[PDB]
């Protein structure tokens with residue numbers, strides 16, 4: 001029993017965090033095998049940030065301009081290349097603490113753990129979701145650039161996010177581990193804004209199934225809905241459209257609790273109309289959308305209360 | 306910017322988790338130096354009588370794919386200490402500390418000696434923790450990190466009928482009036498950790514959330530009467546002194562912020578949220594707020 005926002009154990013990722021310094025800029029790098037991956041803006045000055053030509057800035061750098069520090073040991077850079085918005089520094093030592101890993105690009109609504117670091121040193125771990133507007137509501141300060149997001153399903157670490165910037169509204173933007181940004185963002189200090197955000201509907205539904213598993217049913221009703229009528233109502237509350245894929249994905253939770261997806265959609269509809277009326281669901285007075293159908297199955301039991 | 310419930314990096318603790326099996330019972334153990342610490346109910350009650358019948362080979366300790374050889378055993382309160390033949394090479398710098406209600410810590414939840422997740426939580430005033438635990442989680446541990454030293458403060462033992470959790474410090478002393486047995490036990494009525502709600506209101510002001518601030522101030526005596534009416538823990542002069550740095554950083558006196566909390570209790574949020582919450586959050590200490598709004602590393 002119980003339902004917490006839970007992050008993956010960060011140990012396998014802590015053993016990969018290094019500090020990358022290029023001139024006056026210092027940020028974090030991810031050391032896997034004999035390569036250190038970090039944001040390419042480490043080669044920029046704050047001036048360059050408005051309209052930087054990364055190819056022109058990089059061609060003027062030599063291997064010895066990059067200082068890579070792994071704990072108290074200095075790593076020797078023996079090569080460098082750029083892949084999209086990520087800089088790849090070939091080092092002379094392979095990381096002995098390199099875990100089994102994959103680079104994965106995630107879709108909006110997917111969750112992951114973030115290991116926030118400063119000066120190549122991990123400070124904290126938290127769980128978050130890729131928002132529909134491609135931003136993450138993280139907790140990052142200056143020096144956090146290069147911190148990574150990951151999932152550890154089985155003994156393999158799937159790296160999905162590398163932190164690059166904070167937007168004017170306080171939300172965060174970054175890339176996959178191949179340097180491709182999530183969202184229409186650029187690694188420039190230019191006027192950029194996050195688009196209007198929406199609630200991840202499939203995740204709120206998953207969280208309502210987690211509440212039923214933990215013995216709470218006060219929000220259920222005797223009604224059902226069509227998929228289209230659900231979306232006509234949900235769109236008015238800034239909720240993402242629920243697709244047939246989402247319905248199929250909620251199948252196992254529907255079978256475990258005996259509550260059809262469209263009947264759970266009717267409870268959601270009524271919750272949006274009525275609010276909670278002094279009640280909470282899983283200790284929350286808001287409808288939670290940062291737990292996927294997969295997270296709920298992982299954290300909750302197989303026997304409903 | 307941003308404010309998340311943040312746990313300490315779990316790496317130093319992951320390297321200490323082992324699986325302990327005794328007969329049919331399987332739970333988690335903490336391997337530090339040449340000793341494995343685990344709940345004494347793994348032998349299940351008259352514990353000294355159950356223990357005297359057991360021999361070293363009855364205990365199966367597994368560290369990853371390696372079997373550890375038990376060469377001795379003793380009991381300390383509600384914790385079983387299994388002397389093993391191998392000292393843990395991944396043993397970090399550590400201390401066993403007992404925490405007070407209101408203090409927070411990270412929990413590394415494990416099943417079969419394998420860490421599955423990490424979360425942050427607080428020791429409630431009623432000595433329970435609102436954790437996320439399933440069967441097999443017994444022996445999971447709670448900790449904080451101070452520089453490079455891990456301070457172990459909690460070991461999981463049981464789930465109460467309301468779904469909340471009970472456990473001990475690493476010396477086997479329970480937090481709360483609980484016993485390690487399946488008997489009629491219930492968590493007492495809980496209260497809100499006032500100093501923590503105040504700390505979280507200062508974190509909101511730091512992140513640019515000031516709609517709840519007012520021109521009023523109050524006295525500690527007047528505020529404590531309001532706190533008693535809403536099931537909030539009494540605010541002490543120590544709590545006020547502890548909030549000093551946050552008061553200085555934001556320019557808002559502690560009794561000035563108390564008057565805001567007083568108005569939130571009597572009138573609600575009115576459709577508004579603070580740090581993305583429609584409830585007053587009490588699981589961030591004044592220290593957690595300063596650490597997260599500064600960037601302290603380990």
Ligand SMILES: CNC(=O)CN1C[C@@H](C(=O)Nc2cncc3cc(S(C)(=O)=O)ccc23)c2cc(Cl)ccc2C1=O
Nearest residue numbers: 041140141142144145164165166167186187188189306
């Ligand atoms: C909020 N940012 C700024 O004012 C300046 N700025 C610097 C940099 C950037 O965003 N770094 C940061 C990353 N993560 C959290 C950050 C929190 C802060 S703070 C003190 O807590 O506001 C400051 C900076 C952060 C950057 C990188 C790129 Cl690729 C593109 C643009 C920029 C940029 O605009």
Ligand SMILES: CNC(=O)CN1C[C@@H](C(=O)Nc2cncc3cc(S(C)(=O)=O)ccc23)c2cc(Cl)ccc2C1=O
Nearest residue numbers: 001301346438439440442443462463464465485486487
């Ligand atoms: C709710 N528990 C029970 O019905 C039986 N029970 C077993 C055991 C105990 O509490 N273990 C558990 C610990 N943490 C989470 C647990 C979640 C669950 S569940 C399937 O997800 O409901 C079950 C058991 C859990 C225990 C240990 C001691 Cl020292 C004293 C008493 C007991 C005890 O009463």
Ligand SMILES: [Cl-]
Nearest residue numbers: 105106107110
């Ligand atoms: Cl995905």
